[PDB]
Protein backbone atom coordinates (compact mmCIF):
# COMPACT_ATOMS: atom_id res chain seq x y z
CA UNK A 1 0.00 0.00 0.00
CA UNK A 2 1.46 3.34 -1.10
CA UNK A 3 0.55 5.82 1.65
CA UNK A 4 0.49 9.55 0.92
CA UNK A 5 -1.51 12.60 1.95
CA UNK A 6 -2.11 16.14 0.71
CA UNK A 7 -2.10 19.44 2.62
CA UNK A 8 -0.40 17.77 5.59
CA UNK A 9 3.19 19.04 5.17
CA UNK A 10 4.78 21.82 3.09
CA UNK A 11 6.74 20.51 0.11
CA UNK A 12 9.17 21.73 -2.54
CA UNK A 13 10.22 18.53 -4.37
CA UNK A 14 7.12 16.32 -3.89
CA UNK A 15 6.87 13.31 -6.19
CA UNK A 16 7.57 12.58 -9.85
CA UNK A 17 7.37 15.31 -12.47
CA UNK A 18 9.11 16.60 -15.60
CA UNK A 19 10.36 20.09 -16.43
CA UNK A 20 9.70 22.36 -19.41
CA UNK A 21 10.52 25.94 -20.43
CA UNK A 22 9.19 29.16 -18.89
CA UNK A 23 7.40 32.00 -20.68
CA UNK A 24 6.19 35.41 -19.50
CA UNK A 25 3.79 38.18 -20.53
CA UNK A 26 1.34 35.74 -22.15
CA UNK A 27 -1.90 34.26 -20.86
CA UNK A 28 -0.62 30.69 -20.57
CA UNK A 29 -1.36 27.53 -18.59
CA UNK A 30 1.05 26.59 -15.80
CA UNK A 31 1.45 23.89 -13.15
CA UNK A 32 4.16 24.63 -10.58
CA UNK A 33 4.18 21.14 -9.05
CA UNK A 34 0.70 21.06 -7.53
CA UNK A 35 -0.11 24.77 -8.00
CA UNK A 36 -2.43 24.85 -11.02
CA UNK A 37 -3.77 28.00 -12.64
CA UNK A 38 -3.95 30.15 -15.75
CA UNK A 39 -2.71 33.71 -16.13
CA UNK A 40 0.06 36.08 -17.14
CA UNK A 41 3.33 35.50 -15.28
CA UNK A 42 5.14 38.82 -15.24
CA UNK A 43 8.33 39.38 -13.28
CA UNK A 44 7.60 40.32 -9.67
CA UNK A 45 8.79 43.29 -7.63
CA UNK A 46 7.89 42.01 -4.14
CA UNK A 47 10.61 41.13 -1.64
CA UNK A 48 10.23 37.64 -0.17
CA UNK A 49 12.04 35.68 2.54
CA UNK A 50 14.30 32.66 1.90
CA UNK A 51 11.87 30.18 3.48
CA UNK A 52 8.77 31.84 2.04
CA UNK A 53 7.50 30.31 -1.19
CA UNK A 54 3.95 31.36 -2.10
CA UNK A 55 2.14 34.69 -2.00
CA UNK A 56 -1.40 35.89 -1.41
CA UNK A 57 -3.52 39.00 -0.86
CA UNK A 58 -6.54 40.24 1.10
CA UNK A 59 -9.04 37.82 -0.46
CA UNK A 60 -6.60 34.90 0.01
CA UNK A 61 -5.90 34.20 -3.66
CA UNK A 62 -2.58 33.55 -5.35
CA UNK A 63 -0.74 36.72 -6.40
CA UNK A 64 2.92 35.65 -6.72
CA UNK A 65 5.03 32.51 -6.98
CA UNK A 66 8.68 31.48 -6.68
CA UNK A 67 10.53 29.60 -9.40
CA UNK A 68 11.30 26.07 -8.12
CA UNK A 69 14.59 26.01 -10.06
CA UNK A 70 15.97 29.54 -10.46
CA UNK A 71 14.42 30.75 -7.17
CA UNK A 72 13.06 34.06 -8.45
CA UNK A 73 9.70 35.73 -7.86
CA UNK A 74 7.18 36.35 -10.66
CA UNK A 75 3.59 37.58 -10.55
CA UNK A 76 0.27 36.03 -11.60
CA UNK A 77 -2.56 37.93 -13.30
CA UNK A 78 -5.78 36.84 -15.06
CA UNK A 79 -5.88 37.71 -18.75
CA UNK A 80 -8.50 40.40 -19.27
CA UNK A 81 -11.97 38.92 -19.31
CA UNK A 82 -14.95 41.17 -19.96
CA UNK A 83 -18.26 41.63 -21.72
CA UNK A 84 -19.51 43.02 -25.01
CA UNK A 85 -22.35 45.35 -25.94
CA UNK A 86 -23.95 46.02 -29.33
CA UNK A 87 -24.98 49.57 -30.22
CA UNK A 88 -27.61 49.84 -32.93
CA UNK A 89 -29.67 52.74 -34.30
CA UNK A 90 -32.43 50.18 -34.72
CA UNK A 91 -33.23 47.76 -37.53
CA UNK A 92 -35.69 50.35 -38.66
CA UNK A 93 -33.41 53.09 -40.02
CA UNK A 94 -30.25 51.11 -40.82
CA UNK A 95 -28.40 47.86 -40.10
CA UNK A 96 -24.93 48.96 -38.96
CA UNK A 97 -23.70 48.18 -35.45
CA UNK A 98 -20.83 49.23 -33.19
CA UNK A 99 -19.42 46.65 -30.77
CA UNK A 100 -18.06 47.84 -27.42
CA UNK B 1 -18.28 38.41 2.05
CA UNK B 2 -19.40 37.21 -1.39
CA UNK B 3 -15.78 36.82 -2.53
CA UNK B 4 -14.68 35.02 0.64
CA UNK B 5 -17.64 32.63 0.33
CA UNK B 6 -15.85 30.91 -2.57
CA UNK B 7 -13.43 28.91 -0.39
CA UNK B 8 -15.82 26.60 1.44
CA UNK B 9 -16.12 22.82 1.35
CA UNK B 10 -19.94 22.82 1.48
CA UNK B 11 -19.64 19.19 2.58
CA UNK B 12 -17.41 18.11 -0.32
CA UNK B 13 -13.90 16.71 -0.67
CA UNK B 14 -12.34 20.03 -1.65
CA UNK B 15 -13.32 23.63 -2.36
CA UNK B 16 -11.40 23.87 -5.66
CA UNK B 17 -12.94 22.54 -8.87
CA UNK B 18 -9.58 21.71 -10.45
CA UNK B 19 -8.51 19.41 -7.61
CA UNK B 20 -11.79 17.47 -7.71
CA UNK B 21 -11.68 17.16 -11.49
CA UNK B 22 -8.05 16.02 -11.66
CA UNK B 23 -8.12 13.68 -8.65
CA UNK B 24 -11.52 12.05 -9.30
CA UNK B 25 -13.38 10.39 -12.15
CA UNK B 26 -16.64 11.99 -13.39
CA UNK B 27 -19.18 9.38 -12.22
CA UNK B 28 -18.55 10.01 -8.51
CA UNK B 29 -17.13 13.54 -8.74
CA UNK B 30 -20.50 14.66 -10.11
CA UNK B 31 -21.97 14.74 -6.60
CA UNK B 32 -19.16 16.98 -5.31
CA UNK B 33 -19.59 19.30 -8.29
CA UNK B 34 -23.34 19.45 -7.61
CA UNK B 35 -22.76 20.31 -3.95
CA UNK B 36 -20.42 23.16 -4.88
CA UNK B 37 -22.92 24.37 -7.49
CA UNK B 38 -25.73 24.48 -4.93
CA UNK B 39 -23.63 26.30 -2.34
CA UNK B 40 -22.36 28.99 -4.69
CA UNK B 41 -25.79 29.47 -6.27
CA UNK B 42 -27.38 29.99 -2.85
CA UNK B 43 -24.72 32.51 -1.83
CA UNK B 44 -25.15 34.48 -5.06
CA UNK B 45 -28.94 34.49 -4.64
CA UNK B 46 -28.66 35.90 -1.12
CA UNK B 47 -26.26 38.60 -2.31
CA UNK B 48 -28.60 39.63 -5.14
CA UNK B 49 -31.62 39.83 -2.84
Amino acid sequence: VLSFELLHAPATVCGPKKSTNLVKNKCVNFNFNGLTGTGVLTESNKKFLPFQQFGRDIADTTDAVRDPQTLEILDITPCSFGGVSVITPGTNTSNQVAVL
Amino acid sequence: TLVKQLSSNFGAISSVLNDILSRLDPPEAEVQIDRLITGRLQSLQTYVT
Binding site: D57, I58, A59, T61, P78, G82, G83 | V3, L6
Partner: peptide, 27 residues
Protein backbone atom coordinates in the same frame (compact mmCIF):
# COMPACT_ATOMS: atom_id res chain seq x y z
CA UNK C 1 -7.75 74.81 -9.69
CA UNK C 2 -10.01 72.05 -11.12
CA UNK C 3 -12.41 74.33 -12.89
CA UNK C 4 -15.80 73.83 -11.27
CA UNK C 5 -15.01 72.47 -7.79
CA UNK C 6 -15.41 75.13 -5.09
CA UNK C 7 -13.39 74.97 -1.84
CA UNK C 8 -16.21 73.30 0.11
CA UNK C 9 -16.61 70.68 -2.62
CA UNK C 10 -12.85 70.08 -2.46
CA UNK C 11 -12.98 69.63 1.31
CA UNK C 12 -15.87 67.18 0.94
CA UNK C 13 -14.08 65.19 -1.77
CA UNK C 14 -10.84 64.96 0.20
CA UNK C 15 -12.62 64.03 3.43
CA UNK C 16 -14.37 61.00 1.89
CA UNK C 17 -11.86 58.18 1.42
CA UNK C 18 -12.61 54.58 0.46
CA UNK C 19 -10.33 47.03 -5.31
CA UNK C 20 -8.33 44.51 -7.34
CA UNK C 21 -10.16 42.62 -10.07
CA UNK C 22 -11.45 39.16 -9.21
CA UNK C 23 -13.23 36.23 -10.89
CA UNK C 24 -16.43 37.53 -12.49
CA UNK C 25 -16.60 40.85 -10.66
CA UNK C 26 -16.86 44.09 -12.61
CA UNK C 27 -17.68 47.73 -11.88
Amino acid sequence: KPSKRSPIEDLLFNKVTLAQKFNGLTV
